[PDB]
mmCIF file of C-alpha atoms and ligand atoms in Angstrom:
data_model
loop_
_atom_site.group_PDB
_atom_site.id
_atom_site.type_symbol
_atom_site.label_atom_id
_atom_site.label_comp_id
_atom_site.label_asym_id
_atom_site.label_seq_id
_atom_site.Cartn_x
_atom_site.Cartn_y
_atom_site.Cartn_z
ATOM 1 C CA UNK A 1394 -67.897 -4.881 10.447
ATOM 2 C CA UNK A 1395 -64.376 -3.490 10.130
ATOM 3 C CA UNK A 1396 -62.785 -6.875 9.389
ATOM 4 C CA UNK A 1397 -60.039 -5.575 7.123
ATOM 5 C CA UNK A 1398 -57.488 -7.355 4.898
ATOM 6 C CA UNK A 1399 -55.570 -10.227 6.428
ATOM 7 C CA UNK A 1400 -51.877 -9.668 7.308
ATOM 8 C CA UNK A 1401 -49.553 -9.782 4.285
ATOM 9 C CA UNK A 1402 -47.655 -13.022 3.584
ATOM 10 C CA UNK A 1403 -43.947 -13.282 2.934
ATOM 11 C CA UNK A 1404 -42.422 -13.697 -0.511
ATOM 12 C CA UNK A 1405 -38.756 -14.556 -0.767
ATOM 13 C CA UNK A 1406 -36.351 -15.915 -3.351
ATOM 14 C CA UNK A 1407 -34.014 -18.813 -2.595
ATOM 15 C CA UNK A 1408 -31.187 -18.967 -2.470
ATOM 16 C CA UNK A 1409 -31.202 -15.287 -3.535
ATOM 17 C CA UNK A 1410 -32.902 -12.354 -5.307
ATOM 18 C CA UNK A 1411 -29.792 -11.637 -7.377
ATOM 19 C CA UNK A 1412 -29.975 -14.460 -9.921
ATOM 20 C CA UNK A 1413 -27.429 -14.871 -12.719
ATOM 21 C CA UNK A 1414 -28.873 -16.016 -16.033
ATOM 22 C CA UNK A 1415 -29.375 -19.755 -16.423
ATOM 23 C CA UNK A 1416 -29.131 -20.191 -12.652
ATOM 24 C CA UNK A 1417 -31.962 -21.485 -10.398
ATOM 25 C CA UNK A 1418 -34.300 -19.508 -8.151
ATOM 26 C CA UNK A 1419 -37.249 -20.499 -6.016
ATOM 27 C CA UNK A 1420 -39.940 -17.963 -5.146
ATOM 28 C CA UNK A 1421 -41.815 -18.907 -1.987
ATOM 29 C CA UNK A 1422 -44.972 -17.191 -0.731
ATOM 30 C CA UNK A 1423 -45.665 -17.888 2.933
ATOM 31 C CA UNK A 1424 -48.714 -17.013 4.985
ATOM 32 C CA UNK A 1425 -49.805 -18.087 8.477
ATOM 33 C CA UNK A 1426 -51.477 -21.470 8.957
ATOM 34 C CA UNK A 1427 -54.981 -21.555 7.506
ATOM 35 C CA UNK A 1428 -54.442 -20.386 3.953
ATOM 36 C CA UNK A 1429 -57.046 -21.760 1.550
ATOM 37 C CA UNK A 1430 -55.593 -20.210 -1.539
ATOM 38 C CA UNK A 1431 -52.292 -18.690 -2.523
ATOM 39 C CA UNK A 1432 -51.669 -16.442 -5.490
ATOM 40 C CA UNK A 1433 -48.245 -15.463 -6.765
ATOM 41 C CA UNK A 1434 -48.087 -12.929 -9.571
ATOM 42 C CA UNK A 1435 -45.548 -11.226 -11.822
ATOM 43 C CA UNK A 1436 -46.576 -7.561 -11.919
ATOM 44 C CA UNK A 1437 -45.468 -6.869 -15.512
ATOM 45 C CA UNK A 1438 -47.790 -9.444 -17.049
ATOM 46 C CA UNK A 1439 -50.621 -9.553 -14.524
ATOM 47 C CA UNK A 1440 -50.292 -13.325 -14.906
ATOM 48 C CA UNK A 1441 -50.676 -15.206 -11.630
ATOM 49 C CA UNK A 1442 -50.685 -18.796 -10.382
ATOM 50 C CA UNK A 1443 -52.560 -20.468 -7.541
ATOM 51 C CA UNK A 1444 -49.459 -22.080 -6.071
ATOM 52 C CA UNK A 1445 -47.294 -20.659 -3.274
ATOM 53 C CA UNK A 1446 -44.065 -21.705 -5.007
ATOM 54 C CA UNK A 1447 -42.656 -20.630 -8.374
ATOM 55 C CA UNK A 1448 -39.515 -22.553 -9.310
ATOM 56 C CA UNK A 1449 -37.312 -21.157 -12.081
ATOM 57 C CA UNK A 1450 -34.669 -23.810 -12.979
ATOM 58 C CA UNK A 1451 -32.749 -21.478 -15.296
ATOM 59 C CA UNK A 1452 -33.111 -17.705 -14.787
ATOM 60 C CA UNK A 1453 -34.144 -15.863 -17.976
ATOM 61 C CA UNK A 1454 -34.323 -12.148 -18.767
ATOM 62 C CA UNK A 1455 -38.109 -12.307 -19.131
ATOM 63 C CA UNK A 1456 -38.511 -13.761 -15.657
ATOM 64 C CA UNK A 1457 -36.698 -10.803 -14.074
ATOM 65 C CA UNK A 1458 -38.944 -8.216 -12.479
ATOM 66 C CA UNK A 1459 -41.379 -7.452 -9.657
ATOM 67 C CA UNK A 1460 -43.484 -10.123 -7.965
ATOM 68 C CA UNK A 1461 -46.120 -10.000 -5.242
ATOM 69 C CA UNK A 1462 -48.284 -12.663 -3.694
ATOM 70 C CA UNK A 1463 -51.390 -12.685 -1.552
ATOM 71 C CA UNK A 1464 -53.555 -15.366 -0.022
ATOM 72 C CA UNK A 1465 -57.149 -15.933 0.918
ATOM 73 C CA UNK A 1466 -58.471 -17.336 4.195
ATOM 74 C CA UNK A 1467 -62.231 -17.733 4.294
ATOM 75 C CA UNK A 1468 -63.749 -15.073 2.057
ATOM 76 C CA UNK A 1469 -60.945 -12.690 3.014
ATOM 77 C CA UNK A 1470 -57.889 -11.753 0.951
ATOM 78 C CA UNK A 1471 -54.726 -10.599 2.669
ATOM 79 C CA UNK A 1472 -52.616 -7.536 2.007
ATOM 80 C CA UNK A 1473 -50.094 -8.156 -0.735
ATOM 81 C CA UNK A 1474 -46.587 -9.192 0.336
ATOM 82 C CA UNK A 1475 -43.827 -6.636 -0.098
ATOM 83 C CA UNK A 1476 -42.761 -6.683 -3.720
ATOM 84 C CA UNK A 1477 -39.992 -9.153 -4.454
ATOM 85 C CA UNK A 1478 -37.640 -7.545 -6.942
ATOM 86 C CA UNK A 1479 -36.244 -10.459 -8.967
ATOM 87 C CA UNK A 1480 -32.977 -9.367 -10.567
ATOM 88 C CA UNK A 1481 -31.186 -11.187 -13.374
ATOM 89 C CA UNK A 1482 -27.408 -10.823 -13.479
ATOM 90 C CA UNK A 1483 -24.981 -11.553 -16.292
ATOM 91 C CA UNK A 1484 -27.206 -9.734 -18.758
ATOM 92 C CA UNK A 1485 -24.287 -7.545 -19.797
ATOM 93 C CA UNK A 1486 -20.493 -7.414 -19.820
ATOM 94 C CA UNK A 1487 -19.129 -6.930 -16.317
ATOM 95 C CA UNK A 1488 -17.987 -3.459 -15.249
ATOM 96 C CA UNK A 1489 -14.603 -2.830 -13.599
ATOM 97 C CA UNK A 1490 -14.098 -1.972 -9.935
ATOM 98 C CA UNK A 1491 -11.087 0.055 -8.791
ATOM 99 C CA UNK A 1492 -10.059 2.517 -6.103
ATOM 100 C CA UNK A 1493 -10.704 5.070 7.604
ATOM 101 C CA UNK A 1494 -12.826 5.715 4.515
ATOM 102 C CA UNK A 1495 -12.287 4.544 0.926
ATOM 103 C CA UNK A 1496 -13.865 5.492 -2.406
ATOM 104 C CA UNK A 1497 -14.289 2.964 -5.210
ATOM 105 C CA UNK A 1498 -15.469 3.602 -8.752
ATOM 106 C CA UNK A 1499 -17.541 1.154 -10.768
ATOM 107 C CA UNK A 1500 -16.641 1.715 -14.410
ATOM 108 C CA UNK A 1501 -18.963 0.453 -17.136
ATOM 109 C CA UNK A 1502 -19.175 0.952 -20.914
ATOM 110 C CA UNK A 1503 -22.826 0.577 -21.996
ATOM 111 C CA UNK A 1504 -23.523 4.030 -20.599
ATOM 112 C CA UNK A 1505 -25.741 2.680 -17.821
ATOM 113 C CA UNK A 1506 -26.691 5.080 -15.023
ATOM 114 C CA UNK A 1507 -27.026 2.635 -12.139
ATOM 115 C CA UNK A 1508 -24.543 0.793 -9.930
ATOM 116 C CA UNK A 1509 -24.661 -1.659 -7.066
ATOM 117 C CA UNK A 1510 -21.695 -2.483 -4.873
ATOM 118 C CA UNK A 1511 -21.598 -5.139 -2.174
ATOM 119 C CA UNK A 1512 -19.125 -6.576 0.329
ATOM 120 C CA UNK A 1513 -19.311 -10.356 0.494
ATOM 121 C CA UNK A 1514 -20.707 -11.690 3.739
ATOM 122 C CA UNK A 1515 -22.810 -8.310 3.594
ATOM 123 C CA UNK A 1516 -23.439 -4.657 2.749
ATOM 124 C CA UNK A 1517 -24.993 -3.004 -0.320
ATOM 125 C CA UNK A 1518 -24.406 0.399 -1.892
ATOM 126 C CA UNK A 1519 -26.643 1.511 -4.766
ATOM 127 C CA UNK A 1520 -25.835 4.790 -6.531
ATOM 128 C CA UNK A 1521 -26.622 6.770 -9.681
ATOM 129 C CA UNK A 1522 -22.935 7.695 -10.018
ATOM 130 C CA UNK A 1523 -19.962 5.459 -11.007
ATOM 131 C CA UNK A 1524 -18.123 6.706 -7.907
ATOM 132 C CA UNK A 1525 -19.117 5.261 -4.521
ATOM 133 C CA UNK A 1526 -17.446 6.022 -1.204
ATOM 134 C CA UNK A 1527 -17.682 3.390 1.511
ATOM 135 C CA UNK A 1528 -17.857 5.112 4.907
ATOM 136 C CA UNK A 1529 -16.468 2.470 7.269
ATOM 137 C CA UNK A 1530 -13.346 1.118 5.546
ATOM 138 C CA UNK A 1531 -14.053 -2.536 6.416
ATOM 139 C CA UNK A 1532 -11.663 -5.139 5.043
ATOM 140 C CA UNK A 1533 -13.437 -7.507 2.663
ATOM 141 C CA UNK A 1534 -14.127 -8.546 -0.929
ATOM 142 C CA UNK A 1535 -16.050 -6.102 -3.144
ATOM 143 C CA UNK A 1536 -17.871 -6.465 -6.466
ATOM 144 C CA UNK A 1537 -20.144 -4.161 -8.457
ATOM 145 C CA UNK A 1538 -22.914 -4.403 -11.046
ATOM 146 C CA UNK A 1539 -23.925 -1.817 -13.621
ATOM 147 C CA UNK A 1540 -27.360 -1.248 -15.146
ATOM 148 C CA UNK A 1541 -29.878 1.119 -16.718
ATOM 149 C CA UNK A 1542 -32.687 2.696 -14.695
ATOM 150 C CA UNK A 1543 -34.852 1.961 -17.736
ATOM 151 C CA UNK A 1544 -34.563 -1.784 -16.980
ATOM 152 C CA UNK A 1545 -33.587 -1.706 -13.270
ATOM 153 C CA UNK A 1546 -33.894 -5.504 -13.013
ATOM 154 C CA UNK A 1547 -31.542 -6.572 -15.798
ATOM 155 C CA UNK A 1548 -28.015 -6.393 -14.354
ATOM 156 C CA UNK A 1549 -24.578 -6.946 -15.861
ATOM 157 C CA UNK A 1550 -22.219 -9.713 -14.815
ATOM 158 C CA UNK A 1551 -20.463 -8.835 -11.551
ATOM 159 C CA UNK A 1552 -17.130 -7.054 -11.808
ATOM 160 C CA UNK A 1553 -13.936 -8.899 -10.906
ATOM 161 C CA UNK A 1554 -13.602 -8.769 -7.111
ATOM 162 C CA UNK A 1555 -11.555 -5.965 -5.582
ATOM 163 C CA UNK A 1556 -10.040 -7.167 -2.318
ATOM 164 C CA UNK A 1557 -10.046 -4.373 0.236
ATOM 165 C CA UNK A 1558 -7.569 -4.980 3.036
ATOM 166 C CA UNK A 1559 -7.003 -2.543 5.905
ATOM 167 C CA UNK A 1560 -4.015 -2.950 8.206
ATOM 168 C CA UNK B 191 38.408 7.581 -32.590
ATOM 169 C CA UNK B 192 36.340 5.889 -29.895
ATOM 170 C CA UNK B 193 32.658 4.813 -29.668
ATOM 171 C CA UNK B 194 29.650 7.074 -29.113
ATOM 172 C CA UNK B 195 27.335 7.194 -26.092
ATOM 173 C CA UNK B 196 24.568 4.557 -26.062
ATOM 174 C CA UNK B 197 21.037 5.436 -27.177
ATOM 175 C CA UNK B 198 17.881 4.914 -25.191
ATOM 176 C CA UNK B 199 15.397 2.213 -26.116
ATOM 177 C CA UNK B 200 11.918 2.618 -24.692
ATOM 178 C CA UNK B 201 8.538 0.992 -25.323
ATOM 179 C CA UNK B 202 5.244 2.926 -25.270
ATOM 180 C CA UNK B 203 2.829 3.134 -23.707
ATOM 181 C CA UNK B 204 4.588 0.268 -21.865
ATOM 182 C CA UNK B 205 7.094 -2.586 -22.198
ATOM 183 C CA UNK B 206 4.385 -4.777 -20.672
ATOM 184 C CA UNK B 207 1.957 -5.404 -23.492
ATOM 185 C CA UNK B 208 -1.206 -7.468 -23.284
ATOM 186 C CA UNK B 209 -1.704 -9.698 -26.344
ATOM 187 C CA UNK B 210 -3.685 -8.046 -29.148
ATOM 188 C CA UNK B 211 -2.671 -4.647 -27.768
ATOM 189 C CA UNK B 212 -0.263 -2.180 -29.441
ATOM 190 C CA UNK B 213 3.298 -1.193 -28.525
ATOM 191 C CA UNK B 214 5.890 0.954 -30.263
ATOM 192 C CA UNK B 215 9.645 0.693 -29.666
ATOM 193 C CA UNK B 216 11.820 3.748 -30.089
ATOM 194 C CA UNK B 217 15.603 4.010 -30.296
ATOM 195 C CA UNK B 218 16.973 7.476 -29.492
ATOM 196 C CA UNK B 219 20.533 8.743 -29.484
ATOM 197 C CA UNK B 220 22.070 12.248 -29.720
ATOM 198 C CA UNK B 221 20.724 14.641 -32.369
ATOM 199 C CA UNK B 222 21.929 14.120 -35.927
ATOM 200 C CA UNK B 223 23.010 10.472 -36.145
ATOM 201 C CA UNK B 224 23.381 8.793 -39.561
ATOM 202 C CA UNK B 225 21.950 5.309 -39.004
ATOM 203 C CA UNK B 226 19.906 3.476 -36.401
ATOM 204 C CA UNK B 227 19.939 -0.273 -35.844
ATOM 205 C CA UNK B 228 17.223 -2.047 -33.857
ATOM 206 C CA UNK B 229 17.528 -5.768 -33.200
ATOM 207 C CA UNK B 230 15.732 -8.590 -31.429
ATOM 208 C CA UNK B 231 18.205 -10.918 -29.709
ATOM 209 C CA UNK B 232 16.189 -14.109 -30.398
ATOM 210 C CA UNK B 233 16.496 -13.868 -34.171
ATOM 211 C CA UNK B 234 19.470 -11.503 -34.209
ATOM 212 C CA UNK B 235 17.422 -10.006 -37.081
ATOM 213 C CA UNK B 236 17.410 -6.208 -37.256
ATOM 214 C CA UNK B 237 16.019 -3.162 -39.029
ATOM 215 C CA UNK B 238 17.919 0.045 -39.810
ATOM 216 C CA UNK B 239 15.344 2.461 -38.363
ATOM 217 C CA UNK B 240 14.683 3.723 -34.838
ATOM 218 C CA UNK B 241 10.977 2.957 -34.591
ATOM 219 C CA UNK B 242 9.195 -0.395 -34.585
ATOM 220 C CA UNK B 243 5.406 -0.401 -34.394
ATOM 221 C CA UNK B 244 3.530 -3.464 -33.252
ATOM 222 C CA UNK B 245 -0.200 -3.022 -34.010
ATOM 223 C CA UNK B 246 -1.094 -6.214 -32.147
ATOM 224 C CA UNK B 247 1.280 -7.764 -29.613
ATOM 225 C CA UNK B 248 2.130 -11.400 -30.397
ATOM 226 C CA UNK B 249 3.732 -14.112 -28.285
ATOM 227 C CA UNK B 250 6.631 -14.470 -30.731
ATOM 228 C CA UNK B 251 7.165 -10.712 -30.515
ATOM 229 C CA UNK B 252 7.982 -10.869 -26.810
ATOM 230 C CA UNK B 253 11.624 -10.994 -25.783
ATOM 231 C CA UNK B 254 14.750 -8.845 -25.661
ATOM 232 C CA UNK B 255 15.495 -5.930 -28.007
ATOM 233 C CA UNK B 256 18.580 -3.755 -28.367
ATOM 234 C CA UNK B 257 19.721 -0.897 -30.560
ATOM 235 C CA UNK B 258 22.764 1.082 -31.653
ATOM 236 C CA UNK B 259 23.345 4.009 -33.973
ATOM 237 C CA UNK B 260 26.129 4.816 -36.406
ATOM 238 C CA UNK B 261 27.267 8.426 -36.849
ATOM 239 C CA UNK B 262 29.944 8.933 -39.447
ATOM 240 C CA UNK B 263 31.536 5.489 -39.384
ATOM 241 C CA UNK B 264 31.590 5.199 -35.604
ATOM 242 C CA UNK B 265 29.234 2.928 -33.663
ATOM 243 C CA UNK B 266 27.758 3.684 -30.257
ATOM 244 C CA UNK B 267 27.750 1.439 -27.235
ATOM 245 C CA UNK B 268 24.597 -0.734 -27.451
ATOM 246 C CA UNK B 269 21.476 0.527 -25.674
ATOM 247 C CA UNK B 270 20.330 -1.278 -22.569
ATOM 248 C CA UNK B 271 18.251 -4.327 -23.407
ATOM 249 C CA UNK B 272 14.508 -3.686 -23.651
ATOM 250 C CA UNK B 273 12.525 -6.641 -22.327
ATOM 251 C CA UNK B 274 9.267 -6.628 -24.286
ATOM 252 C CA UNK B 275 6.780 -8.643 -22.222
ATOM 253 C CA UNK B 276 3.526 -10.196 -23.421
ATOM 254 C CA UNK B 277 0.842 -10.350 -20.703
ATOM 255 C CA UNK B 278 -2.392 -12.291 -20.865
ATOM 256 C CA UNK B 279 -0.622 -15.408 -22.076
ATOM 257 C CA UNK B 280 -1.873 -17.486 -19.151
ATOM 258 C CA UNK B 281 -4.793 -17.526 -16.733
ATOM 259 C CA UNK B 282 -4.460 -14.740 -14.170
ATOM 260 C CA UNK B 283 -3.265 -15.711 -10.689
ATOM 261 C CA UNK B 284 -5.149 -14.771 -7.530
ATOM 262 C CA UNK B 285 -3.742 -12.185 -5.133
ATOM 263 C CA UNK B 286 -4.540 -12.377 -1.417
ATOM 264 C CA UNK B 287 -3.294 -10.895 1.838
ATOM 265 C CA UNK B 288 -1.573 -13.204 4.304
ATOM 266 C CA UNK B 289 -1.581 -13.078 8.127
ATOM 267 C CA UNK B 290 1.184 -11.000 9.680
ATOM 268 C CA UNK B 291 2.804 -11.447 13.110
ATOM 269 C CA UNK B 292 0.636 -10.285 16.016
ATOM 270 C CA UNK B 293 3.507 -8.172 17.314
ATOM 271 C CA UNK B 294 4.907 -5.116 15.486
ATOM 272 C CA UNK B 295 6.138 -5.676 11.921
ATOM 273 C CA UNK B 296 7.294 -2.267 10.661
ATOM 274 C CA UNK B 297 4.620 -1.793 8.021
ATOM 275 C CA UNK B 298 5.559 -5.114 6.421
ATOM 276 C CA UNK B 299 2.744 -6.733 4.431
ATOM 277 C CA UNK B 300 2.703 -10.248 3.008
ATOM 278 C CA UNK B 301 0.776 -10.951 -0.156
ATOM 279 C CA UNK B 302 0.335 -14.279 -1.944
ATOM 280 C CA UNK B 303 0.285 -14.588 -5.713
ATOM 281 C CA UNK B 304 -1.283 -18.004 -6.267
ATOM 282 C CA UNK B 305 -1.447 -19.821 -9.582
ATOM 283 C CA UNK B 306 -1.311 -23.532 -10.402
ATOM 284 C CA UNK B 307 0.558 -23.721 -13.729
ATOM 285 C CA UNK B 308 3.608 -24.546 -11.617
ATOM 286 C CA UNK B 309 5.284 -21.245 -12.529
ATOM 287 C CA UNK B 310 8.392 -20.092 -10.674
ATOM 288 C CA UNK B 311 8.412 -16.336 -11.141
ATOM 289 C CA UNK B 312 6.127 -13.644 -9.789
ATOM 290 C CA UNK B 313 5.887 -9.934 -10.405
ATOM 291 C CA UNK B 314 3.875 -7.982 -7.881
ATOM 292 C CA UNK B 315 3.090 -4.311 -8.300
ATOM 293 C CA UNK B 316 1.360 -1.362 -6.716
ATOM 294 C CA UNK B 317 -0.390 0.780 -9.305
ATOM 295 C CA UNK B 318 0.787 4.361 -9.424
ATOM 296 C CA UNK B 319 -2.018 6.915 -9.586
ATOM 297 C CA UNK B 320 -1.611 10.087 -11.732
ATOM 298 C CA UNK B 321 -1.554 13.767 -10.683
ATOM 299 C CA UNK B 322 -2.547 15.959 -8.793
ATOM 300 C CA UNK B 323 -1.082 13.036 -6.836
ATOM 301 C CA UNK B 324 1.437 11.366 -9.148
ATOM 302 C CA UNK B 325 2.288 8.202 -7.240
ATOM 303 C CA UNK B 326 4.989 5.983 -8.755
ATOM 304 C CA UNK B 327 4.420 2.334 -9.590
ATOM 305 C CA UNK B 328 6.360 0.010 -7.317
ATOM 306 C CA UNK B 329 7.449 -3.370 -8.617
ATOM 307 C CA UNK B 330 8.288 -6.461 -6.568
ATOM 308 C CA UNK B 331 9.717 -9.641 -8.036
ATOM 309 C CA UNK B 332 9.966 -13.002 -6.280
ATOM 310 C CA UNK B 333 10.945 -16.591 -7.078
ATOM 311 C CA UNK B 334 8.066 -17.837 -4.941
ATOM 312 C CA UNK B 335 4.309 -16.982 -4.594
ATOM 313 C CA UNK B 336 4.492 -15.553 -1.092
ATOM 314 C CA UNK B 337 5.906 -12.022 -0.975
ATOM 315 C CA UNK B 338 6.397 -9.721 2.005
ATOM 316 C CA UNK B 339 6.337 -6.026 1.183
ATOM 317 C CA UNK B 340 8.379 -4.057 3.707
ATOM 318 C CA UNK B 341 6.766 -0.815 4.854
ATOM 319 C CA UNK B 342 4.107 -1.265 2.193
ATOM 320 C CA UNK B 343 2.472 1.833 0.746
ATOM 321 C CA UNK B 344 -1.303 2.106 0.510
ATOM 322 C CA UNK B 345 -2.473 1.364 -3.009
ATOM 323 C CA UNK B 346 -3.922 -1.025 -5.553
ATOM 324 C CA UNK B 347 -1.907 -4.191 -6.085
ATOM 325 C CA UNK B 348 -1.875 -6.803 -8.840
ATOM 326 C CA UNK B 349 0.481 -9.643 -9.673
ATOM 327 C CA UNK B 350 1.634 -11.763 -12.599
ATOM 328 C CA UNK B 351 3.086 -15.245 -12.668
ATOM 329 C CA UNK B 352 5.403 -16.762 -15.234
ATOM 330 C CA UNK B 353 8.176 -19.246 -15.885
ATOM 331 C CA UNK B 354 11.913 -18.569 -15.925
ATOM 332 C CA UNK B 355 11.955 -20.678 -19.104
ATOM 333 C CA UNK B 356 10.026 -17.972 -21.001
ATOM 334 C CA UNK B 357 10.493 -14.873 -18.748
ATOM 335 C CA UNK B 358 8.808 -12.638 -21.311
ATOM 336 C CA UNK B 359 5.484 -14.477 -21.513
ATOM 337 C CA UNK B 360 3.468 -13.427 -18.490
ATOM 338 C CA UNK B 361 0.002 -14.385 -17.332
ATOM 339 C CA UNK B 362 -2.866 -11.913 -17.328
ATOM 340 C CA UNK B 363 -2.890 -9.576 -14.290
ATOM 341 C CA UNK B 364 -4.583 -10.861 -11.141
ATOM 342 C CA UNK B 365 -7.707 -9.184 -9.745
ATOM 343 C CA UNK B 366 -6.850 -5.986 -7.813
ATOM 344 C CA UNK B 367 -6.170 -5.790 -4.086
ATOM 345 C CA UNK B 368 -6.518 -2.432 -2.326
ATOM 346 C CA UNK B 369 -4.102 -2.156 0.583
ATOM 347 C CA UNK B 370 -4.920 0.495 3.179
ATOM 348 C CA UNK B 371 -1.968 0.798 5.552
ATOM 349 C CA UNK B 372 -2.790 1.787 9.134
HETATM 350 CL CL1 CL C 2213 -41.110 -5.238 -14.303
#
């Protein structure tokens, strides 16, 4: 009577969601045992496939974007998986990264309004301002990406690494 | 009558010029001198004017420069040699922090400027931020890739590698390293 939508499957990208152009990425939709049909779809085109796995040998700009997948067991469809945001990097010239609590500034030229900073393994910092301030000054290697909120999935090449070292 | 005081010889914005970038040399002695003479030691060739403009820095333009001025018929001592350096001539080295002794070390910090060209000269430096802070640049030169900075100041560091055979042709600057002394 109240048999609602089956539990959402998982949708991940291997080895990662941040995919530089021409590099490989595998999108895998995973549901519990008993799936009769899988369906992976790219939200921008409303074009889906019946296979759980979408392999992209060489990442292209047109393959960047939002993806969701669902599955059917019996005559029941599941909830959609969380949206996988497939990002393409190297779409633009890399920005520059420069300097208890430290503040770094990601400087770009294209006039983008978005930035992403991350400490290699991990920690991400997304901001709509070229000046980010890491709270816990944790020694490590940093890099940032710059992009436009108009195409939030097409990212520049990573900046040269800035090695943070606290004594 | 004896010789006149030596003039200054300065490059701007810097004596370290990345290839393709501009640099202007300026000779400057007391007010009112008659003639200026600016030379490059490699060709011993000169020009009788105080300013030399280089729209785009070239490898062959790197090297030592010197200048003197003539007032009346008297010459001045020669200016100090200006070492015009071309950076970005080689692949940038990689700068990393090295392990320090577990016991006290007096602020000492050891950095490694690693390249593979087989170079034998390294120039390490802490960038100097502008005002309202005005922090001076601090240069460190070594004949080997591993350099210990005594009582190191917090700051952004970068290094260059080069050969003693062509001391004025430096590599491109390494990626930055932000040292936070504690
Ligand atoms: Cl999209």
